[PDB]
Design an enzyme around this catalytic site. Structure first.
Site, PDB file in Angstrom:
ATOM      1  N   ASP A 121     101.379  23.947  53.111  1.00 41.30           N
ATOM      2  CA  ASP A 121     100.605  23.284  52.060  1.00 41.30           C
ATOM      3  C   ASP A 121     101.125  23.711  50.682  1.00 41.30           C
ATOM      4  O   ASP A 121     101.327  24.909  50.407  1.00 41.30           O
ATOM      5  CB  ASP A 121      99.133  23.663  52.247  1.00 41.30           C
ATOM      6  CG  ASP A 121      98.177  22.818  51.435  1.00 41.30           C
ATOM      7  OD1 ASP A 121      98.520  21.723  50.945  1.00 41.30           O
ATOM      8  OD2 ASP A 121      97.037  23.274  51.287  1.00 41.30           O
ATOM      9  N   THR A 159      96.539  16.798  50.038  1.00 38.97           N
ATOM     10  CA  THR A 159      96.817  17.349  51.363  1.00 38.97           C
ATOM     11  C   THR A 159      96.516  16.425  52.560  1.00 38.97           C
ATOM     12  O   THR A 159      97.422  16.124  53.345  1.00 38.97           O
ATOM     13  CB  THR A 159      96.162  18.734  51.523  1.00 38.97           C
ATOM     14  OG1 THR A 159      96.877  19.674  50.707  1.00 38.97           O
ATOM     15  CG2 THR A 159      96.209  19.198  52.972  1.00 38.97           C
ATOM     16  N   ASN A 180      91.211  13.019  49.002  1.00 37.70           N
ATOM     17  CA  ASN A 180      90.499  14.184  49.533  1.00 37.70           C
ATOM     18  C   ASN A 180      88.999  13.955  49.470  1.00 37.70           C
ATOM     19  O   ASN A 180      88.231  14.599  50.172  1.00 37.70           O
ATOM     20  CB  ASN A 180      90.846  15.444  48.748  1.00 37.70           C
ATOM     21  CG  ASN A 180      92.145  16.090  49.198  1.00 37.70           C
ATOM     22  OD1 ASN A 180      92.666  15.836  50.301  1.00 37.70           O
ATOM     23  ND2 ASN A 180      92.677  16.950  48.337  1.00 37.70           N
ATOM     24  N   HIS A 265      97.339  26.995  43.149  1.00 42.30           N
ATOM     25  CA  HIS A 265      96.208  26.498  42.387  1.00 42.30           C
ATOM     26  C   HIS A 265      95.745  27.520  41.338  1.00 42.30           C
ATOM     27  O   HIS A 265      95.469  27.152  40.202  1.00 42.30           O
ATOM     28  CB  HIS A 265      95.050  26.100  43.310  1.00 42.30           C
ATOM     29  CG  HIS A 265      95.166  24.713  43.856  1.00 42.30           C
ATOM     30  ND1 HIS A 265      95.020  23.589  43.071  1.00 42.30           N
ATOM     31  CD2 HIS A 265      95.379  24.266  45.115  1.00 42.30           C
ATOM     32  CE1 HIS A 265      95.172  22.509  43.819  1.00 42.30           C
ATOM     33  NE2 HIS A 265      95.372  22.892  45.067  1.00 42.30           N
ATOM     34  N   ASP A 683     101.895 -11.860  46.110  1.00 49.99           N
ATOM     35  CA  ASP A 683     101.032 -10.965  46.862  1.00 49.99           C
ATOM     36  C   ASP A 683      99.608 -10.940  46.285  1.00 49.99           C
ATOM     37  O   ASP A 683      99.143  -9.906  45.823  1.00 49.99           O
ATOM     38  CB  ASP A 683     101.640  -9.555  46.938  1.00 49.99           C
ATOM     39  CG  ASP A 683     100.961  -8.678  48.002  1.00 49.99           C
ATOM     40  OD1 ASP A 683     100.348  -9.243  48.932  1.00 49.99           O
ATOM     41  OD2 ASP A 683     101.037  -7.435  47.911  1.00 49.99           O
ATOM     42  N   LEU A 689     102.480  -7.573  51.630  1.00 45.56           N
ATOM     43  CA  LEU A 689     103.143  -8.527  52.500  1.00 45.56           C
ATOM     44  C   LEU A 689     103.180  -9.908  51.870  1.00 45.56           C
ATOM     45  O   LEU A 689     102.273 -10.276  51.115  1.00 45.56           O
ATOM     46  CB  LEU A 689     102.429  -8.598  53.859  1.00 45.56           C
ATOM     47  CG  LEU A 689     102.206  -7.259  54.585  1.00 45.56           C
ATOM     48  CD1 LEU A 689     101.236  -7.416  55.752  1.00 45.56           C
ATOM     49  CD2 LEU A 689     103.535  -6.674  55.068  1.00 45.56           C
TER      50      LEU A 689
END
Ligand SMILES: *[C@@H]1O[C@H](CO)[C@@H](O[C@@H]2O[C@H](CO)[C@@H](O[C@@H]3O[C@H](CO[C@H]4O[C@H](CO)[C@@H](O)[C@H](O[C@H]5O[C@H](CO)[C@@H](O)[C@H](O)[C@@H]5O[C@H]5O[C@H](CO)[C@@H](O)[C@H](O)[C@@H]5O)[C@@H]4O)[C@@H](O)[C@H](O[C@H]4O[C@H](CO)[C@@H](O)[C@H](O)[C@@H]4O[C@H]4O[C@H](CO)[C@@H](O)[C@H](O)[C@@H]4O)[C@@H]3O)[C@H](O)[C@H]2NC(C)=O)[C@H](O)[C@H]1NC(C)=O
Ligand SMILES: O=C(OCc1ccc(OC(F)(F)F)cc1)N1C[C@@H]2CN(C(=O)[C@@H]3CCc4[nH]nnc4C3)C[C@H]2C1
Ligand SMILES: [Ca+2]
Ligand SMILES: [Cl-]
Ligand code: NA
Ligand code: NA
Ligand SMILES: [Zn+2]
Length: 806
Positions: A121, A159, A180, A265, A683, A689
């Protein structure tokens, strides 16, 4: 309730989960408070520590010990990792010369080399060089194995989105872990780092590697590890698992470290406190490799050393507050930090309007450290829109900065010095990849690649068919000694028409005009040849793009460019042309300023008309092949054909004209010629797509001329720039973009200035992979080169980031 009366005896770190038998003993029971009474005593033994000592050698087995130094420990598979070193006179793995691993060297009964994913991490890409002195085990993996200088994460560079992207090969918008912190409006449920809701199955989409493995008869160790289980225990557990009987032993394993992110951090990416976390991580890698070497598995296992994201310097004082921009600040909810996501505090508030919010956040301060977007206007390369969990309003935050709703949120929540989550092309957000083992190459460096590609490779490493994903399978074949995946080029679905001259000028009532009617067998045979495709070899360098969907289209040949013209969308799907280093820029002559010419190969009914553009006060028109770059005054008439015309807002014409008039020539000079393919993209549902005709939300007023949401260009040259683009013997070089087709330039705060001060910055932001354009157009490029198909796939996944060296 959990009646934890059961026992973990003989059940420690059980691979198969239990529900009916009440008590749990897996590395996840802690997160449920459902472990057996004896879990800690039996499964988390710490007695005597983690290393053998000279006096422990040959000892009587004492089951209380964290690991063992007795004679029987090897067969039991539970020695401390340094046992053979301390007791049997063996050397640490890191002190051994590296030797090529040409073939797996595995014990009898291993059906395939196991894969171990060692994930770290917050491990920024530059740690590999900068921390190299304090990380000898990792430096050995890196220099002896296969490595990239860096690996690109997905946005947001958080993360969970990234670890789950690694696991699935999917963009966050597809796998559903888009941050998160998340709110799903369909379930009316919140996902939080802390708590229970994140474990609910409905958050996690696609098919992660462990499910792919299981469903195909390949056993997996658990991927998730409880925070309080120490790293040494995690290692010993994996090593124990590797000693299981053939029919029970997993082939795939994951280790996870909370470091160096945890310290980054608090201390910033390069705080002096960062040395120790890097040392500890390297020590853990050493224990794993020593442990494998003890088990005779160190030339058997494939090991991947991989990060989720990097880490940037961010401090409290570098926070923008929405309360400085909005008067209505309490009517909104903000997901804050290194990105911003805004929605209405209450869906009953009829006064809430995203348009006034966007406007109040647009270029309001001199050095504004965030930019507001409707999510569908974010750079297409981020693939960050097609999920109901992504709020309509997004703030892209400058690196080093935070956004918050109001100052109280920041001082009543300076502690932190590092953060991540920024735009995934940002250098500080880049992470690491090393692959080491029989299936990876020896002492090989590979170019940087995106983490969405790894799922496919982990499937290749394990002999698995990957679930459908966003990787381009085969684009990482150059990482592998064997087990490469060799795909075939997709089949063309639609064959082109090749129309000749079929219509008289007078059949066209398009309201167009051109001062072209000014009149030779020498140059008339010559111009017919050009219209038959006699210069096509010059302007179509890599073959024509294949159309991978059912449609009706024409190939149109010209002296200076070739195009695939859509009868359905009334414009080219693609326009291809080569500009040599020596090419000259000319102006549009006066008599030709507003000239649009009927194309006599294409019916009036399949053409645009100038009257619709006249009538549409918002919409104007541009050209895909730029008139400025015509090869002669006669050839220039070709660039004014109605079949080379595309709808453009006057605000976007400023961008497009500068690209065409200025930048193409600049690239041709810097790169020794460039080949350009340009075209429109539609799009409207922002799914990345190609839209079908029935999905188009905007037409040129009064017409069936569909308005593109984006314009792309793909700019190709020789990687060896001493060779001209049109005469290249070896590998290619590409950069591409997908520019949003917008009616204003609000995105560019400097836009009232000369294009030379803002357009290139806009284009850099909207840099793209050829593959991104493929999804968006249903086209398949580079069909006819002399290069390996896998090499072409790598080229199609390339992204030119415009960041300086990592
Ligand atoms: C990156 O790679 C991925 C993987 O290849 C690509 O994503 C795929 O795109 C496909 C094409 O759009 C899409 O195919 C659709 O599948 C629908 C059924 O989907 C369910 O089953 C699959 C298989 O198990 C599963 O994967 C899906 O999981 C999604 O949804 C759940 C929620 O239930 C999420 O938990 C999960 O994360 C995932 O969500 C993602 O995709 C959905 C869209 O499917 C988004 O809404 C989410 O935001 C998120 O992005 C599902 O459980 C199927 O219903 C579709 O069929 C409709 O459309 C076709 C067009 O051919 C039409 O013929 C059919 O009739 C049908 O239309 C009918 O329904 C319409 C809508 O309800 C209605 O309007 C019509 O009137 C019709 O009645 C379609 O075939 C596929 O699901 C996803 N797969 C994944 C994993 O996302 C992605 O495109 C790639 N990205 C890029 C840029 O290349
Ligand atoms: O053991 C793990 O991961 C193995 C893996 C390896 C490769 C993977 O990728 C691949 F499969 F590809 F290999 C996937 C998973 N994990 C990852 C989780 C991230 N995490 C968190 O973010 C905490 C949530 C609870 C919480 N409360 N307060 N702060 C927090 C932070 C807890 C970690 C445990
Ligand atoms: Ca679409
Ligand atoms: Cl988030
Ligand atoms: Na107009
Ligand atoms: Na502007
Ligand atoms: Zn973090």
């Amino acid at each position: 309730w959990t009646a934890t009366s059961g026992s973990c005896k003989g059940r420690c770190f059980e691979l198969q989960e239990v529900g009916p038998p009440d008590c749990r003993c897996d590395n996840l029971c802690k997160s449920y408070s459902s472990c057996c009474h004896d879990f800690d005593e039996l499964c988390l033994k710490t007695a005597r520590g983690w290393e053998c000592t000279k006096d422990r050698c040959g000892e009587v087995r004492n089951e209380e010990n964290a690991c063992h130094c007795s004679e029987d420990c090897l067969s039991r598979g539970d020695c401390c990792t340094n046992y053979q070193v301390v007791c049997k006179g063996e050397s640490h793995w890191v002190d051994d010369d590296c030797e090529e691993i040409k073939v797996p060297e595995c014990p009898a009964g291993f059906v395939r080399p196991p894969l171990i994913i060692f994930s770290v991490d917050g491990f920024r890409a530059s740690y590999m060089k900068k921390g190299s002195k304090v990380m000898p085990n990792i430096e050995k993996l890196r220099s002896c194995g296969t490595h990239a200088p860096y690996m690109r994460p997905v946005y947001p560079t958080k993360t969970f989105p990234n670890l789950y992207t690694l696991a699935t090969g999917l963009y966050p918008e597809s796998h559903g872990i888009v941050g998160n912190s998340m709110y799903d409006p369909v379930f009316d449920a919140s996902f939080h780092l802390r708590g229970r809701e994140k474990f609910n199955h409905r958050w996690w989409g696609g098919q992660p590697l462990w499910i792919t493995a299981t469903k195909q008869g390949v056993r997996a160790g658990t991927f998730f590890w409880s925070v309080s289980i120490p790293h040494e225990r995690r290692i010993l557990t994996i090593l124990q698992w590797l000693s299981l009987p053939d029919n029970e032993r997993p082939s795939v394993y994951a280790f996870y470290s909370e470091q160096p992110d945890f310290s980054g951090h608090k201390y910033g990416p390069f705080g002096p406190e960062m040395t120790n976390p890097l040392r500890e991580i390297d020590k853990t890698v050493g224990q794993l490799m020593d442990g494998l070497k003890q088990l005779r598995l160190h030339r058997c296992v494939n090991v991947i050393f991989v990060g989720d994201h990097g880490m940037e310097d961010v401090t409290c004082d570098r926070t923008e507050f929405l309360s400085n921009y909005l008067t209505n600040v309490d009517d909104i909810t903000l997901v804050p930090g290194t990105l911003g996501r805004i929605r209405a505090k209450s869906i009953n508030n009829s006064k809430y309007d995203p348009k006034t919010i966007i406007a109040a956040l647009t270029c309001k301060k001199p050095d504004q450290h965030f930019k507001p977007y409707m999510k569908q206007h974010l750079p297409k390369r981020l693939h960050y829109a097609n999920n109901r969990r992504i709020e309509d309003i997004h703030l892209l935050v400058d690196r080093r900065w935070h956004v918050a709703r109001k100052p109280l949120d920041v001082y009543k929540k300076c502690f932190f010095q590092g953060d991540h989550g920024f735009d995934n092309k940002v250098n500080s957000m880049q992470t690491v990849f090393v692959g080491y083992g029989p299936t990876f190459k020896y002492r090989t460096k590979v170019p940087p690649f995106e983490n969405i590609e790894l799922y496919n490779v982990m499937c290749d490493l394990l002999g698995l068919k990957p679930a459908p994903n966003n990787g381009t399978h085969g684009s990482l074949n150059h990482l592998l000694r064997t087990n490469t995946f060799r795909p075939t080029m997709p089949d063309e679905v639609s064959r082109p028409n090749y129309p000749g001259i079929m219509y008289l000028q007078s059949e066209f009532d398009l309201g167009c005009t051109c001062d072209d009617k000014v009149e030779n067998k020498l140059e008339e045979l010559n111009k017919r040849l050009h219209t038959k495709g006699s210069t096509k070899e010059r302007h179509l360098l890599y073959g024509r793009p294949a159309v991978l969907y059912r449609t009706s289209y024409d190939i149109l040949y010209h002296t200076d460019f070739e195009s695939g013209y859509s009868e359905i969308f009334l414009m080219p799907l693609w326009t291809s042309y080569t500009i040599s280093k020596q090419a000259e820029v000319s102006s549009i002559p006066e008599h030709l300023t507003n000239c649009v010419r009927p194309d006599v190969r294409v019916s009036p009914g399949f053409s645009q008309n100038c009257l619709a553009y006249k009538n549409d006060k918002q919409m104007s028109y541009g050209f895909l092949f730029p008139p400025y770059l015509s090869s002669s005054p006669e050839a220039k008439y070709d660039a004014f054909l109605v079949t080379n015309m595309v709808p453009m807002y006057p605000a976007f014409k400023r961008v497009w004209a500068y690209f065409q008039r200025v930048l193409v020539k600049k690239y041709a000079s810097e790169r020794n010629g460039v080949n350009v393919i340009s075209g429109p993209i539609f799009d409207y549902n922002y799914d990345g797509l190609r839209d079908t005709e029935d999905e188009i939300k905007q037409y040129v007023e009064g017409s069936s001329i569909p308005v593109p949401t984006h314009y792309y260009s793909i700019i190709t040259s020789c990687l060896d720039f001493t060779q001209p683009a049109d005469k290249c013997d070896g590998p290619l070089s590409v950069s591409s973009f997908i520019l949003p087709h917008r009616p204003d330039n609000d995105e560019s705060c400097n836009s009232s200035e000369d294009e030379s001060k803002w357009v290139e910055e806009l284009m850099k932001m909207h840099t793209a992979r050829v593959r991104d354009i493929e999804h968006l157009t249903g086209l398949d490029f580079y069909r006819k080169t002399s290069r390996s198909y896998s090499e072409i796939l790598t080229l199609k996944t390339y992204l030119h980031t415009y960041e300086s060296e990592i």
